Amino acid sequence: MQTIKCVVVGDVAVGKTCLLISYTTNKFPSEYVPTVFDNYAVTVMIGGEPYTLGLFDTAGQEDYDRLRPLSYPQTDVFLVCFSVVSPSSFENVKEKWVPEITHHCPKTPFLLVGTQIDLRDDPSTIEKLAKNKQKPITPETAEKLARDLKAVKYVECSALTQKGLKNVFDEAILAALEPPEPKKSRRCVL
Amino acid sequence: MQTIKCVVVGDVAVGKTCLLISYTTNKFPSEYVPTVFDNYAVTVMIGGEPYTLGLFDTAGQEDYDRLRPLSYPQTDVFLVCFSVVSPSSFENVKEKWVPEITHHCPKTPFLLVGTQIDLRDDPSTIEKLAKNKQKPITPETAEKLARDLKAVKYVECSALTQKGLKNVFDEAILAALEPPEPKKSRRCVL
């Protein structure tokens, strides 16, 4: 059986876990959201062949800067996430996450993922957003950052409404798909 | 370069073209629908590699039973479409469409595509439907037909709201992805 490793990174609270659960369980963790990350698997049919898709959540706290990279080995693709309603999370993508990923896994592809896009149109949100003359990160703004940082592409979604959620992982797979050629892989290595 | 041929079939008026245009132009032709039976081409990145995705529209009219199949050679995957609000279109999937592409392309994979899912919750349609002793097709029903007829999987969308539209073609690609040695090619032949 063939496998694809996808590590998910990003600032704390951007909705990494919710999007993983929502995707794997088809239901948004409205109840007790496991405030303790995990490791999931999904079986995906590609060309009529079954593939195991490993999804790895991570801890975004600085105190894990030491540990976190321990999961990177073997990753076929990364999901650098930021909330389209959190500028901090967005700026922190170029300053921290991309650099980190590129450092250890330089050949490993990554996608830029905007999360919680349902809160962009939300009134209650943009109301406390102008409380620093800021506005929701735009797709183009994000698309631009993606272009610059050289991400495979930009994708956003809502773990809550599940909008584009499936697509986020479809792209992950497409990007992850390795080359048969003399093991010309992009898999991360110690 | 590397290419994937996707032929789209289905009863007239299920929305094959609108879904093709909506996906390729990112805009639903709300104005007037292009009467010419065209084929489009999209470039898709798979494993960091550029692939050309050919999308071929067809004429579902009984008057082209003879001609229509002329576009089947080389197809990597088919999209058998029916509107989730047109029972006749759904019946014809098993009655006409699958039988036909199966006859011409026995080894070629296909997806079942429910179209116009936005109309499932539309009063007017639901009324007019119920009046003629009918009701919109439900995912379960379709999923069951997909299971029976042995479709790669069932997927629906709205070319109008674009919901699930990208996904329909993501699945098409995944399903189309051919195997290493050409001995196990699913590309339709004459």
Ligand SMILES: Nc1nc2c(ncn2[C@@H]2O[C@H](COP(=O)(O)OP(=O)(O)O)[C@@H](O)[C@H]2O)c(=O)[nH]1
């Ligand atoms: N509400 C709604 N109408 C649609 C949708 N897709 C197509 N249509 C309409 O369905 C009719 C036939 O669509 P068209 O693409 O020409 O059908 P085709 O002949 O199967 O290609 C037209 O009136 C379209 O505007 C959709 O997603 N939602």
Ligand SMILES: Nc1nc2c(ncn2[C@@H]2O[C@H](COP(=O)(O)OP(N)(=O)O)[C@@H](O)[C@H]2O)c(=O)[nH]1
């Ligand atoms: N509206 C909305 N809220 C979300 C979304 N994803 C996560 N959340 C909420 O955001 C908070 C942080 O999410 P969580 O998964 O714990 O984040 P982390 N720290 O990346 O694991 C939670 O309160 C959660 O319910 C989303 O897509 N939309």
Ligand SMILES: [Mg+2]
């Ligand atoms: Mg048409």
